[PDB]
Symmetry: D2
Subunit: 388 residues, 4 copies
């Protein structure tokens, strides 16, 4: 049989994995090795595993390729390494990238500062407006880069439409699918060429692995492996991290279902709360791109942003008043995590500059975990009531 | 007390480590986490651990900084990531590097193909001839890059002399100290600015970790961390790999002593063997740079190369006739590893091209392990006798 | 706050765990140590952690105590060690135990052969008939021991009724709650004194840990720790195994929901299949103790047994014809596991003897995993059709 | 080839291990699994791995069997579990054991309190006097149990002589060889039937594993596995712990050499110190059984006890004055560990009772690590000078 024929939950559990032929061990063994040995001179010549590859990591790569409906996968040391290994493989001095402006911080730093120092130019545009992507393309443009949903107000990008534009103008589309996971969105099925993830978030899901994955065509992945990883970034994932990620992803389907069920309940609670001015969540019908979200995403996700009445000090008082939600900058963990960017991460950033980046003084971001939603809601209500 | 005052073996065991203040646990705990939590909005702002840092990995970094007599350390996903994170932090389009030609394969690929595609030019020279380094320097030269001892005939580079030349001409000296480990050579003490290692080899020593380390001034390491890793390569080491490397390095002193004691015995055996045309080992007085080696290295190392009579087919027959030595391309493991590059790794490379790279048809490389030297010698004698 | 006040899913995620005070690390650190260090002679005397205890393992013990509504927990090397550490702590030569006959194999061997060789007598009874328990009690009886549901036809034991009988006659009730997990059954809430689990099954859930847990009163657990583990069995759980079990149990609620949802669908499919003579599942209303199950269990479980038409050879042909279900003797894993005891585990056992133990020639046992139920049903239908 | 023919260091590195046939991985894979899968009904019947066995753990067991020159090995959850699994396998109610009085604390508790409650009687004797062993033997005696060297003054037991006595009187000899490791003493070669270790000490050596090992004849080990572990103690070692122990034992030879070299230097320093009344170390010629030690042990060990002038308060002041040595109750770690039993572990024990157990008020125990011996000596001198 072939796991590509089975249902998505079956694939989550089984794809890329099988009992160890040699021993029958069900769990993928942890091949925590640096060295692989040959039986003869001839076997050595023939191979020239390698250790730009590993059996444990191979299982993870194969699984994620199946889940994203891509040909091949490549695991990395971090989400940022997935992104940079991809882009540094594809681009050289003189090349150009059109990127969404609404992207993860480290990605933005890489694109705005690192790439130009290597002679690779980047144009940032509002990717919610596909015409801005088209207008920014140049003969040199190799890649269009997008993230959807995107921080901090969970705006969307129309993957299929953007793919069509990128392709007509001769560029590849790379999509960061971290926020959704393959359970909720499949960019390759909508025309994207390459998908990257931080597995640090939902794919692993257990808050104990930093890692990334790249999924795409065999021809590209081979280059990302044998040139990108081998020569450029050196960002290979350790076998133990691969094993933990394999373990974490076993429950991806059931986790995403619960994250999203909980998040929808919490989003509705927040939308009904008179101390909350705005709630950003793709599952709410007042989301500006609601219908796009319904076509492109199978679930609205486990992340919510919202604005509390009373600005900076109200936000600070609110996060200082929660008892269950944990103050942290991560997402996709089993625990509910909360942050108030204007006081926590963007505190030294000028207030008017924060505003231009969509970060208002009262904006709170919530990564909804697997706790009872009534407990999360009660904690939020407690903190909001105190803060306002 | 301060471990910088203690003897080198004491430092190997204790530097960068202490019982856990919270629990008393002697072993450094494995902080296998992706998420760190704040107690308040204020604590979050104050920090802005981070997860461009980790307590387990910090211990390793601190330990290696002490052992190399450097200010600070930075762990990475691989030796190649240590090298590229370093060089991509230091260099941008228009910059220049003078490199030894006798360097590790992946490093050579990075320098010869990857760097120029980012507008960074590289001149390769024979670093055993410091005048060639001087002559190749340009106003744009940011870095002189060397490895010593160097493959495949274990030639040396005079670190102190090269440092003086690099510095007079305004460049930094980066030394790959993988071959020796800090137990046997300390490039920073000889004027190098930055040391890199693949900890995959001797520092870990147990053949089960891929990883790298960078050691240098705090100001540089901060840039390598907060720009190089964070933005460019994403090549961060997993906490479990850091913990294993901490564990492996506990025995670095006793391992290096035994590796080198065994290697000297084996080298002398080989030098006395009439079927062996040449033996390359810094501990043999006929080594071309023997006296330099005695000043710069505290021990002659655990690696030997030698040429067997009868060229390509003799080398192939020899490695196919060993019973104890394992056929593998790694080094620094507890097991003795052997390889015959002309049949194993460089088989598709043209014979005359192999020759120019110092790889003769009969060249065998040996990474001497911790077995009884009489057993290793007996195995070699058995295989050599058969092969010739 | 106090996690004993929160909802059960919130407890599953958070109970016994908190961010590391020292570092903020969210994941419980892996305290993989054997040695704990003192700051002074006085601190050493004061303590006399210990290493009959460990911070990682403590977190697991505390969590499971909360989930079972018990005072304290004690982790062990295996489910069988949880059972024997418990019983060998409680009993000495001359004591007596009344046990269900329908119990796990290794437990039965311990009780039938090991205990009597230590002068501890055991009477086996049909625990579905509480009167048989009463009748078997003696002045020497220290413990009544039960498992529910019980192999191989998933019969039940009325915990509350049996607890009342045991207590009136001066004995403790020990319940093996492995099959259900605390998510589905809480024996202490029904009057049991001590609960044991193999965490190897559902609590860990990921098929990669062997381990046990004991939950009960502080006074008893202290004896099980400081006498049972320390002196008698030595069966302590490794910190890494505790960490993995903590990680696995994070998803216990969502896993059990999906296991049971899938199992109910599969059980109904099997009950409608004319090639299947019997289906044993607590969720089917024809189960002999259905109403008891509805009072005592919050969900009917993830395990099903059924009898296929055509006896021994049909069962063999059936398990040889599945493509998705894996042939294995475990349960509680994320993968669906199937076994045919009469051909696989009880093959050398006389056919008439198997019958007395409730193992008919056509009996198949199924541990339902997290795959799509349509895929599991299709695989079963395929195999059944072929086999019959 | 057969590693039983090779030198002891070669065996330490290679015995029980080989590159993974399936993948070539040099490191023994970590088979962190609970479940093993069958390919058919027939394969399932045929096996009936098992999970009273595991490939990683098997490698460790095989290695230790080679090192002790025994037929077979069995890994356990702890040293105490190695001991109790052994003795509870061998003995039943009515049986008798003759034991040394000078044995590890937990062992003593098991023998003095646990065994008699199971109807197994124990006679304690001074095993330095083989005539006391002979005189204590009864028709019921199944086992003579000894430890050598033995706490707290490092007295010895003549293994060969005691084996001869035990055997003539029809009993087995079990030796706890933890203190020495197989590198320094081989009890089976001297006539012992079974050797047990806490691998927590020297065999692992890295202070991060609790575990035990049993080595003996295949027939006995099979019973210890399939009855002792399976039915009685449940004390199985986790695969990860086995892997770590395999990793630790790679350096056993070089570690023991350095421990003992350092300990001899320190013992001589202490013997020359006028504030030190006595020094107990088998390497000092004034040791009461010095010549026996020279015949039975290849090295005098890494442990020293000594008495400081000034009794209880001097001992307390001394351990409170060390800066490098760590206060802990373990031994065999890479770090030097120190303890003062009269103030630390035996503080609540009556002074006259401590005396009868060989624990004087001024007795200090030292587990010598891998630091520079000059640093350890300087630290001891510093503390002794202050304390006296
Ligand atoms: Cl929930
Ligand atoms: Cl050796
Ligand atoms: Cl499902
Ligand atoms: Cl030393
Ligand atoms: K983040
Ligand atoms: K290599
Ligand atoms: K089972
Ligand atoms: K001890
Ligand atoms: Na694989
Ligand atoms: Na995370
Ligand atoms: Na990788
Ligand atoms: Na506001
Ligand atoms: Na819920
Ligand atoms: Na640290
Ligand atoms: Na290696
Ligand atoms: Na790192
Ligand atoms: Na030749
Ligand atoms: Na040797
Ligand atoms: Na804890
Ligand atoms: Na299992
Ligand atoms: Na335990
Ligand atoms: Na039948
Ligand atoms: Na489903
Ligand atoms: Na094995
Ligand atoms: Na220890
Ligand atoms: Na075991
Ligand atoms: Na004294
Ligand atoms: Na020394």
């Amino acid at each position: 049989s072939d796991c590509r024929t089975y249902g998505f939950n079956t694939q989550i559990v089984h794809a890329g994995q099988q009992p160890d032929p040699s021993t029958g061990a069900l769990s993928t063994p942890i091949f925590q090795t640096s060295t692989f040995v040959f039986d003869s001179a001839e076997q050595g010549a023939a191979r020239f595993y390698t250790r730009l590859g590993n059996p444990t990591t191979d299982a993870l790569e194969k699984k994620l390729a199946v889940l994203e409906r891509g040909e091949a996968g490549l695991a990395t040391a971090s989400g940022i390494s997935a992104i940079t290994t991809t882009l540094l493989t594809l681009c050289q001095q003189g090349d150009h990238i059109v990127s969404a402006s609404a992207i993860y911080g480290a990605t933005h730093a890489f694109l705005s500062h690192s790439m130009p120092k290597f002679g690779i130019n980047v144009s940032f545009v509002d990717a919610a407006k596909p015409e801005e992507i088209r207008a920014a393309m140049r003969p040199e443009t190799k890649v269009v880069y997008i993230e959807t949903p995107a921080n901090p107000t969970l705006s969307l990008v129309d993957i299929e439409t953007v793919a069509g534009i990128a392709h007509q103008q001769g560029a590849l589309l790379v999509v960061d699918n971290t926020f959704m996971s393959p359970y909720c969105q499949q960019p390759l099925q909508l025309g994207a060429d390459i998908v990257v993830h931080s597995v640090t978030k939902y794919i692993n899901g257990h808050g104990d692995v930093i890692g990334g994955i790249i999924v795409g065509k065999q021809e590209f992945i081979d280059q990302a492996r044998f040139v990108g990883l081998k020569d450029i970034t050196g960002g290979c994932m350790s076998p133990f991290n691969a094993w933990l990620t394999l373990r974490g992803v076993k429950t991806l389907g059931i986790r995403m279902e619960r994250h999203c069920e909980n998040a929808l309940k919490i989003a509705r609670f927040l939308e009904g709360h008179p101390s909350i001015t705005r709630v950003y969540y793709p599952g709410l019908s007042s989301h500006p791109q609601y219908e796009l979200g319904q076509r492109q995403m199978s679930l609205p996700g486990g992340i919510i942003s919202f604005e509390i009445a009373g600005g900076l000090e109200a936000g600070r008082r609110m996060i200082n008043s929660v008892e269950l939600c944990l103050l942290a900058v991560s997402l996709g963990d089993t625990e509910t995590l909360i942050q108030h960017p204007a006081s926590m991460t963007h505190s030294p950033v000028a207030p008017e500059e924060r505003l231009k980046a969509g970060i208002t003084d009262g904006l709170i971001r919530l990564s909804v975990g697997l706790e009872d939603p009534e407990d999360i809601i009660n904690d939020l209500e407690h903190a909001i009531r105190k803060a306002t």
